[PDB]
């Protein structure tokens, strides 16, 4: 019953994130392929992606539930084709901003990817499905990652052909999304009131708050983990190591996500326990990622953080899906990702951006670990409040 939609969406998400260009993205548009300077790739190109992500998530959670979650995925698939098509044959920064915009489209519609399956499978499978979905996505990345590595370590494949393989993968993902089964069917203040009815669920607003907050710190860690590794071990070869470790970490997260789907354990009573334990694990790993000036210890801490957070976000998505009791799967997922991106952008402005505090990378992860520890303690003091 649930096997065909789950398998098709898992194949889509695998081929929509099996992107060998992703680990070698910055070298691709900063090397001979595009000849863009590094001060226009991060101060003018990536903020465009962030802004497009915000303004494209804004109509995702509003409209994805109404359109039954397939067109936004199909819009994600087509915009994957546009993103990497302009990433392949678009020179200069004028076209690359448009690509950052379409990648914001694909990332905002990635909310539809997660929320579609809960609108097409019964709640009983919401655990298993969840894991698998998240797992395959993470598997996707690490697959692409390791694939990319081999293509640059054994076949000297140029970054342009890495992006070509990425486009071919997301093209197969678009074809799989075309074959996704269509889910069955089903002023402003009222809409907000509906959101209030959609957010008054049991053990969901707190999982939502974790999603709205912990994933912002996770995305900050994702962005600046390579910079932390460069600070810890300024090695010329470390690059091939760095992304590779991400692969393993992502792979770990994959299996961690694959854990949540596979284990026949009840998160109804262990949801709070899993939240507390693995949020404390994330905080401790982030502190370990910073406090210990050992590159191998930092890699292990990053693997632990990524795997535990992937497990936690899988539990969060599953628990929100079962406890939602409203058809708006992508509204809560979409607004969760939008609020998380808002918090991530705000803490990027303060923590690392020149406009804010501009904290060096040797205290960046200190404050990231402090942020995750604050999140965990908030969910510590919630358990004590429950008593
Ligand atoms: C398709 C090319 C456009 C594009 N590709 C990859 C990223 C990856 N990235 C970069 C910085 C911060 C976060 C993330 C996910 C990006 N922002 N933009």
From Swiss-Prot:
Keyword ATP-binding recorded: no
Reactions accelerated catalytically: thiamine(out) + H(+)(in) = thiamine(in) + H(+)(out); pyridoxine(out) + n H(+)(out) = pyridoxine(in) + n H(+)(in)
Extracellular side: 19-43, 93-100, 156-159, 230-242, 290-301, 353-360
GO cellular component: membrane; plasma membrane
Location(s), subcellular: Membrane
One GO process term, biological-process aspect: thiamine diphosphate biosynthetic process
Record site: Essential for pyridoxine transport: 76-77, 81, 83-84, 158, 163
Topology in membrane: Multi-pass membrane protein
Regions that span the bilayer: 1-18, 44-64, 72-92, 101-121, 135-155, 160-180, 209-229, 243-263, 269-289, 302-322, 332-352, 361-381
Phenotype upon changing residue 83 to S: Significant decrease in pyridoxine transport
Residues the record marks as carrying a glycan: 35, 156
Keyword Transmembrane helix in annotation: yes
pH dependency: Optimum pH is 7.5.
Tissue localization of expression: Widely expressed but most abundant in placenta, kidney and liver.
GO molecular function: thiamine transmembrane transporter activity
Keywords linked to the UniProt accession: Disease variant, Glycoprotein, Membrane, Transmembrane, Transmembrane helix, Transport
Record note on what altering residue 81 to A does: Significant decrease in pyridoxine transport
Disease: Basal ganglia disease, biotin-thiamine responsive: An autosomal recessive metabolic disorder characterized by episodic encephalopathy, often triggered by febrile illness, presenting as confusion, seizures, external ophthalmoplegia, dysphagia, and sometimes coma and death. If untreated, encephalopathies can result in permanent dystonia. Brain imaging may show characteristic bilateral lesions of the basal ganglia.
Family recorded in the similarity comment: Belongs to the reduced folate carrier (RFC) transporter (TC 2.A.48) family.
PANTHER family, per the entry: FOLATE TRANSPORTER, THIAMINE TRANSPORTER 2
Name of the protein described by the UniProt record: Thiamine transporter 2
